């Protein structure tokens, strides 16, 4: 019986790979870390409101310029906002209004997004009529899609509800790898910070590591005790944090596959919508339910700070990349800096 | 004052967006936005004829009313990670097809097809994103309701059913079933109507739902209510 | 393509008046400001004025305020000068200047082709363009030197220097804008650099068809002015 013999090495694979886990777990993040200095009271305060969604935001993605970034709401509109001078440098209007995701290339030169539409739309921001426009429309995944990413200006990463991540080629408009094995709706990307691997977060309460050129998981994350919202790479690719229904974040390292360490408080009972790192990775971010956003010293689990300042849930973070500042955005349809 | 010819010309584009979003926010606002959900084939398709991959918007005008309505059915994916987009919807329009009592799901044989709508109905219902949202419940294929009645009473599904087989009985009988999935009667109505799948009606039954529910939104607003 | 035609020119007598039209075709015309530019019969370029996108803003030259009108009518994509009272020193070819402003804009990149308005019988800051003209041997590199009266330099870090060719018989092209930026369609040949008060339009290998005239023009404050233009020869 093939589906027998099959099931049983399951099993025992599966009990290999706990055990491979269990005999590399000589410390934890939290006792090598006890002799390190606390970061001590991070107190941030709001610089910058940008004003202009008139609905819930439901994504931000911040440029590679530090300088610009894009935001997406259900008003079906984006806008690209110059975040030092709070001036709209673009209003695009979207042909779906159910957007979830947005991106900005790192060339700056487009902009990504959608959601419910399980299209993925590239706008062309640098035009010679000087209009911002559509160059292309990416259809193929069969459930919303819940996040884009850009390798380079022909390349994006797409995550969606049909449990399944693709690799777009933007010129030809076709998928080109398809990434399989979640079983779960996927929620989240987040790109290397070579753009050689990708880490997704699904509804199976697991996340996985992808090989983006050979279309491969390589490995399978597990340990929250629910759908994984948000991830995030911790800045020197060999860790990642993620962000849950389950109300915690958990960093993983990826050499050791294992969990290394769990950010949660007794007071926190609410889901974790955006987690992102600090520029050294000693501090986490995460937004949540309860509208505000948590700072953690990440190399402690200890809460660092509080960013208080939305009337409804943080619906994303993002942080610039020299990182002189934070963004959080919300459904009170307010985008804040902060430093 | 400070900034550059640049800057000021590029203040000056900012602005004229702005009052480019105010004007698009306006219109929006005006509009009926309607979730049209229903328990998979039950007359959602011949309702959207009336009233003419992804998510799916209809519009449709009557009586000055734009209104804009999104079929979100064929997402077979989780609801809990995209129905909280529709809070902000002035009703939910939901199909149920009567004629359904005597039918099981293809997927499972001992499953009815009228309890599965009811498990529906109640998870949208129910649902803390929708708490203060009307229903409107239309109840179709009742010319099939009423014909196979007298071949199969309810009890096939209602086991407790002791009403006679008659479809003014059994449809009212089917009608308070879904009606009193209801936990929040004081908090949110469900307009009933059976559309027989051949009224024309349809549209002004939807109509008058929406400017009651219009009409108690500004009752809020204006601090009587 | 993007396309401004100039038309309405022609000749008129001293003291009459004539208005002159440009149609726009191949973009979003009324995102973008726009201005006229006039180059004398000396070659020398001379704004004109602005008319904002919206509208919102007017601004002319001191030799033309109270004279001459400046509009827009973004239904038909046209600019309009009414131009009243001309005098013999209003001889000039008008060009349409296509402008947008945001960060990271690129002004003054899409120069029509100009009208010929033919008619019988300060604080500002002054561009320097000293040479008047230099011989280059094709194959080898050429600089070019702008000198202004008020640094360009901006407390937002932006230095406001813009540099355009005109190559015999053509429209102005944009190559350079805020020093050292590259206009699209530009190749690699041309760098800007400097500082302050003191510019530099650096030619790397030069081409036969980078010959022409290279004018130096600020973008600080409005009026906005050029340089008087240095001749690439050879």
């Known amino acids: 019986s093939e589906l027998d013999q099959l099931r049983q090495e399951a099993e025992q694979l599966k009990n290999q790979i706990r055990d491979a886990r269990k005999a590399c777990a000589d410390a934890t993040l939290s006792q090598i870390t006890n002799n390190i200095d606390p970061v001590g009271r991070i107190q941030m305060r709001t610089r910058r409101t940008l004003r202009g969604h008139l609905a819930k935001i439901y994504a931000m993605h911040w440029g590679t310029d530090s300088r610009l970034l894009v935001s997406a709401s259900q008003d079906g509109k984006l806008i690209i906002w110059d975040s030092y001078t709070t001036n709209k440098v673009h209003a695009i209007p979207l042909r779906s209004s159910w957007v979830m995701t947005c991106a900005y290339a790192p060339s700056g030169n487009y902009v990504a997004c959608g959601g419910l539409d399980n299209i993925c739309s590239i706008y062309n921001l640098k035009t010679r009529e000087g209009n911002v426009r559509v160059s292309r429309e990416l259809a193929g995944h069969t459930g919303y899609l819940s996040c884009c990413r850009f390798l380079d200006d022909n390349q994006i990463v797409t995550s969606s509800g049909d449990t399944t991540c693709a690799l777009w080629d933007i010129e030809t408009g076709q998928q080109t790898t398809t990434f399989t094995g979640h079983t779960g709706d996927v929620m989240s990307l987040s790109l290397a910070p070579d753009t050689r691997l990708f880490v997704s977060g699904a509804c199976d309460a697991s996340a996985k590591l992808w090989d983006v050129r050979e279309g491969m998981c390589r490995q399978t994350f597990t340990g929250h005790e629910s759908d994984i919202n948000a991830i995030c790479f911790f800045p020197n690719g060999n860790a990642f944090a993620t962000g849950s229904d389950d109300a915690t974040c958990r960093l993983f390292d990826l050499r050791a596959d294992q969990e290394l360490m769990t950010y949660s408080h007794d007071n926190i009972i609410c889901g974790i919508t955006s987690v992102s790192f600090s520029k050294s990775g000693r501090l986490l971010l995460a937004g949540y339910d309860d509208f505000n956003c948590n700072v953690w010293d990440a190399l402690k689990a200890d809460r660092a700070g509080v960013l208080a300042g939305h009337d409804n849930r943080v619906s994303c973070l993002g942080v610039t990349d020299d990182g002189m500042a934070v963004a959080t955005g919300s459904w009170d349809s307010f985008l804040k800096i902060w430093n | 004052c400070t900034l550059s010819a640049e800057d000021k010309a590029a203040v000056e584009r900012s602005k004229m967006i702005d009052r480019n979003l105010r004007e698009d926010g306006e219109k929006a606002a005006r509009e009926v936005k309607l979730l049209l959900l229903g328990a998979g084939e039950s007359g959602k398709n011949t309702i959207v004829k009336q009233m003419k991959t992804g998510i799916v918007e209809t519009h449709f005008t009557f009586k000055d009313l734009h209104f804009k309505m999104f079929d979100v059915g064929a997402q077979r994916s989780e609801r809990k990670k995209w129905i909280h987009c529709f809070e902000g919807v002035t009703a939910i329009i939901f199909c149920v097809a009567l004629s359904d009592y005597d039918l099981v799901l293809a997927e499972d044989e001992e499953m009815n097809r009228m309890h599965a709508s009811m498990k529906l109905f109640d998870s949208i219902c129910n649902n803390k994103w929708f708490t203060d949202t009307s229903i409107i419940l239309f109840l179709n294929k009742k010319d099939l309701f009423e014909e196979k009645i007298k071949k199969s009473p309810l009890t096939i599904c209602y086991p407790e059913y002791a009403g006679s087989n008659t479809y003014e009985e059994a449809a009212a009988y089917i009608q308070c079933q879904f009606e009193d999935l209801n936990k929040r009667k004081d908090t949110k109505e469900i307009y009933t109507h059976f559309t027989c799948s051949t009224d024309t009606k349809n549209v002004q039954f939807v109509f008058d739902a929406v400017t009651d529910v219009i009409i108690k939104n500004n009752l809020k607003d204006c601090g009587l209510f | 393509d993007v396309q401004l035609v100039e038309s309405g020119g022609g000749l008129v007598q001293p003291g009459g008046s004539r208005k002159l039209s440009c149609s726009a075709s191949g973009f979003a015309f009324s995102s973008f400001g726009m201005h006229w530019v006039r180059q004398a019969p000396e070659k020398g370029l001379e704004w004109v004025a602005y008319?904002?996108?919206?509208?919102?803003?007017?601004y002319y030259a001191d030799t033309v305020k109270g004279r001459f009108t400046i509009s827009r009518d973004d239904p038909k994509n046209t600019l309009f000068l009414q131009m009243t009272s001309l005098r013999s020193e209003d001889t000039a070819m008008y060009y349409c200047?296509?402008?947008?402003?945001?960060?990271?804009?690129?002004?003054?990149?899409?120069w029509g082709q100009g009208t010929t308005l033919t008619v019988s019988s300060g604080s500002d800051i002054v561009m320097t363009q000293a040479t008047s003209s230099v011989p280059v041997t094709p194959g080898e590199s050429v600089s070019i030197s702008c000198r202004s009266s008020?640094?360009?330099?901006?407390?937002?870090?932006?230095?406001?220097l813009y540099w355009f060719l005109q190559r015999p018989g053509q429209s102005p092209q944009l190559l350079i804008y805020r020093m050292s930026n590259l206009a699209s369609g530009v190749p690699d040949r041309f760098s800007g650099s400097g500082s302050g008060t003191a510019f530099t339009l650096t030619i790397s290998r030069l081409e036969a068809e980078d010959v022409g005239v290279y004018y130096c023009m600020q973008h600080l404050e409005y009026p906005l002015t050029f340089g008087a233009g240095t001749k690439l020869e050879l």
């Open positions: 008020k640094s360009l330099l901006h407390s937002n870090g932006n230095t406001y």
């Open positions: 200047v296509r402008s947008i402003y945001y960060y990271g804009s690129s002004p003054f990149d899409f």
């Open positions: 008319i904002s996108s919206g509208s919102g803003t007017i």
